């Protein structure tokens, strides 16, 4: 039940590398979006901004965790900052996935349902959507505010900052409330978001293929390009996000099915790697989205005559 030997010295390293890269990316995209907000005026601009804020606040609280894992799993800071950092981490996780799926819905509107996108007030629509996204993220994460707390010295003077449950869960209900909140986290994290994304990009891919199935051969090349960007987007989401979910479910099933301690040990050892891999979502999100957006790249860096008229003779 002990963590991998090299983990105590490598997990902080990957965390802090993610901190550096994710800040360099998210701060840059946020600054660019603010600079070009008037220029873009896109209902997806606010969604990109929300994801950028999510990613930046996600990587901002990580360095404290990195230095804590440096200290053989002990929190140095104050319990209030334990709570604030955990809440920021979780809200940024959820809202990163939610902003990705909100951009998915916007692209569904502007790709598969173009008439609805045109008639809908995309400015106010995007504003209301982003407000609802952020408020739902905060409300969902709320429990972590009080569930994370510092303690558990274990006669080692180690003030660990951990997902405390005894405050809400009874001794017999520790497992019950724990599984309830973990289940809520997993489902509202990706089960609805991931299936919504699945249907959205399925329709989007079919529509792009059908649209570019004619016109010219180069049209097929660009169709392949667009299917490729769709595939890489969904595949990056899968690779980065799924492992954290799978180990969530496996760590939970470790109580019911009672997975082997060897396999459970492997699960624990790989869990910090799974946190890093989930962080890879925010690490790449600048590259995945803002790089694709021509407006971000631009910000960071014949006539047809006119109808005449002539007379005839009768």
């Amino acid at each position: 039940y002990t963590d991998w030997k090299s983990s105590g010295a490598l997990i902080p390293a990957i965390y802090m590398l993610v901190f550096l890269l994710g800040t360099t990316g998210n701060g840059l995209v946020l600054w660019t979006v603010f600079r070009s907000s008037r220029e873009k005026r896109r209902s997806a601009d606010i969604f990109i901004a929300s994801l950028a804020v999510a990613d930046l606040t996600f990587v901002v609280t990580l360095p404290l965790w990195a230095t804590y894992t440096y200290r053989d799993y002990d929190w140095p800071f104050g319990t209030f900052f334990c709570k604030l950092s955990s809440y920021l981490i979780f809200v940024n996780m959820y809202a990163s996935v939610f902003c990705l799926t909100g951009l998915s819905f916007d692209r569904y509107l502007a790709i598969v349902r173009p008439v609805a996108n045109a008639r809908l007030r995309l400015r106010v629509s995007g504003a209301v959507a982003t407000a609802v996204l952020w408020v739902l993220a905060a409300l969902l994460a709320m429990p972590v505010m009080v569930l994370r707390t510092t303690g558990d010295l274990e006669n080692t003077t180690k003030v660990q900052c951990y997902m405390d449950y005894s405050m809400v869960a009874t001794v017999s209900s520790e497992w019950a409330w724990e599984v309830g909140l973990g289940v809520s986290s997993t489902t509202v994290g990706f089960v609805v978001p991931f299936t919504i994304m699945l249907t959205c990009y399925f329709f989007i891919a079919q529509t792009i293929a059908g649209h570019f199935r004619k016109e010219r051969i180069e049209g097929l090349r660009k169709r392949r390009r667009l299917l490729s960007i769709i595939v890489v987007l969904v595949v990056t989401f899968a690779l980065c996000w799924m492992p954290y979910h799978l180990v969530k479910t496996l760590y939970m099933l470790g109580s019911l099915l009672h997975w082997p301690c060897d396999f459970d040990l492997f699960l624990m050892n790989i869990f910090p790697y799974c946190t890093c891999i989930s962080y890879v979502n925010s690490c790449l999100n600048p590259f995945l989205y803002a790089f694709f957006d021509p407006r971000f790249r631009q910000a960071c860096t014949d006539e047809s005559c006119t109808t005449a008229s002539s007379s005839l003779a009768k």
Partner: protein, 578 residues
């Protein structure tokens, strides 16, 4: 006549098209005839292909997601105008023979027999804030030079004439579009029997829509509000078929119906775009460019043969809905234009100056002689002028409109002619009923430059009133009551005539579109407002100046396809003095 022409960016390709708007008879559509004048020397061996393209745009700024083009081709047709081999087998229509007589060796006639089943050229609302081309059907005729249809298309040698596909009203009137409904609720006395009727199935654009309503509240349940809304349905069959709704003309009345009481009342609602510019997704009629156009014309599908044509099939219907302490019923009317005798000028006729150099001011002739009264304009007007006959102290009457067409009810003693900017009125025989001065007006631009006055020596109506003289610098308000013209389909052109001079335009109001034009010399003081409840035009007056003394006339004009100033008042004298 006068035929539209457009040259290529280069110049060798020049397309002659008679009319931009083509009548869409349900069974078959008029051929999109024309000619494509080409230079033989430029095309050493190339060919000129004329293509009719019925595009449908659905997303603004195509490639909005970096690659996904957002326009489709509902229907396309092509014709190899040159060389025209015997395989063409296309008879030469009157327009084509007229042109090819007009031109020489570059006579290349192209004909499109577009299929009967297509949507009208109705373009959705661009959206006030939304930027980009409107997402709606649009027809284009492009004569482009190429050797193969799939060859590269050169924008420097490709012409484009946007065409319109509009369905004018059928001469035969349809059945009365009534509708009855009856639903029940908690009480068990008698369902609510709502009946709605409309005056006719065809309502010309902007004319009043008569909504007769009759309900019977036998139960204790009572109606708190009545609501009559002419709604525009844009049945977009593209990709995912789905009918959309956009209320056009709304009237919410607080009229109630007590229990055990029968109620009836004939409302009157008039569609008009001015209070509807901000509603996105609204359907607007054919546009050559971003100029203003009326609400969409109801589509006339083949009778019972509809296969859900791909595109924007515009329909209209009046929903009358009464809310109980929601009984709804619809009437499916058809809001479409009459069949104008002249080509509908799509550009705003008096669009956002010209000096009317008329001559000779005086000429004397006996009865029955042959005389001419010429004119000139500083800038081109393109057969958009009219003529009026002012008998001394008698409201001038419209005689010539469009410089060719003699106004109905006017003797053909007068004939119109155009020659460049010189617009001439030629008399066939000077009858005694000629003791009048003839004026010529240009209405192609907001400054409506009336004629300077050509006095020849023979040797319903609008009631205008509310005028007060001897006002040195005070205000006023002249009232013009229109007996049989609604300001929504009619534009009121208040004009003034100074002593012994041609009239000068004062103020124009066009209720339908909303914008009001004010005379250049009198701008902030003369206000025009046409109250619809009584169809009464009001010319409010402020800060009078000595020269504003004159006899004032209130005018009438068909808001759509502006012909002239036909129906006129008698004239009210107002003087500026102590």
């Amino acid at each position: 006549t006068r035929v539209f022409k457009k040259a290529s960016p280069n110049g060798k390709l020049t397309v002659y098209l008679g009319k931009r708007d083509f009548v869409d008879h349900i069974d078959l559509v008029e051929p999109v005839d024309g000619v494509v004048l080409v230079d033989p020397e430029y095309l050493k061996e190339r060919r000129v292909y004329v293509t009719l393209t019925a595009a449908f745009r659905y997303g603004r700024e195509d490639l909005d997601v970096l690659g996904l083009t957002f326009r489709k081709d509902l229907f396309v047709a092509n014709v190899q105008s040159f060389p025209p081999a015997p395989e063409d087998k296309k008879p030469l229509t009157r327009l084509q023979e007229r042109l090819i007589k007009k031109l020489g060796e570059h006579a290349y006639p192209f004909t499109f027999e577009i299929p009967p089943n297509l949507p009208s050229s109705v373009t959705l609302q661009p959206g006030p804030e939304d930027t980009g081309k409107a997402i709606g059907v649009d027809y284009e005729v492009k004569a482009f030079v190429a050797e193969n249809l799939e060859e590269k298309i050169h924008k420097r040698n490709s012409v484009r004439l946007v065409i319109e596909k509009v369905q004018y009203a059928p001469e035969r009137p349809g059945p009365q579009p009534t509708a009855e409904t009856t639903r029940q609720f908690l009480m068990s006395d008698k369902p609510l029997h709502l009946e709605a009727s409309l005056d006719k199935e065809i309502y010309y654009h902007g004319e009043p829509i008569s909504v007769n309503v009759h309900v019977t509240n036998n139960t204790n349940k009572t109606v708190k509000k009545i609501k009559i809304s002419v709604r525009q349905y844009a049945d977009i069959v593209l990709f995912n078929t789905a009918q959309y709704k956009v209320p056009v003309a709304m009237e919410e009345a607080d009229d109630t119906v007590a229990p055990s009481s029968t109620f009836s009342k004939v409302y009157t609602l008039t569609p008009f775009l001015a209070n509807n510019r901000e509603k996105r997704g609204l359907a607007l009629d054919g546009k050559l460019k971003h100029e203003d156009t009326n609400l969409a014309s109801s589509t006339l599908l083949r009778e019972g043969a509809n296969r859900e044509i791909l595109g924007i099939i515009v329909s209209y219907k009046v929903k009358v809905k009464l809310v109980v302490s929601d009984v709804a019923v619809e009437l499916p009317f058809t809001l479409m234009h009459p069949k104008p005798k002249e080509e509908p000028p799509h550009r705003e006729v008096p669009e956002h100056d010209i000096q009317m150099t008329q001559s000779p001011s005086s000429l004397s002739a006996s009865v029955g002689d042959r005389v001419t009264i010429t004119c000139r304009a500083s800038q081109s007007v393109s057969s958009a002028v009219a003529w009026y006959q002012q008998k001394p102290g008698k409201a001038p009457k419209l005689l010539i409109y469009s410089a060719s067409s003699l106004y109905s009810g006017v003797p053909s003693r007068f004939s119109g002619s155009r020659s460049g900017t010189d617009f001439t009125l030629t008399i066939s025989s000077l009858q005694p009923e000629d003791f009048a001065t003839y004026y010529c007006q240009q209405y192609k631009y907001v400054p409506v430059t009336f004629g300077q006055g050509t006095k020849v020596e023979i040797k319903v109506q609008l009631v205008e009133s509310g005028g007060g003289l001897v006002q040195p610098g005070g205000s006023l308000r002249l009232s013009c009551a229109a007996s049989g013209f609604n300001v929504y389909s009619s534009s009121i052109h208040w004009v003034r005539q100074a002593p012994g001079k041609g009239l000068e335009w004062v103020a124009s109001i066009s209720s339908y579109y909303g914008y009001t034009y004010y005379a250049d010399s009198v701008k902030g003081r003369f206000t025009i407002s046409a109250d619809t409840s009584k169809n009464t035009a009001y010319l409010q007056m402020n800060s009078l100046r000595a020269e504003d003394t004159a006899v004032y006339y209130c005018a009438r004009s068909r808001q759509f396809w502006y012909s002239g100033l036909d129906y006129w008042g008698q004239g009210t004298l107002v003087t500026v003095s102590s």
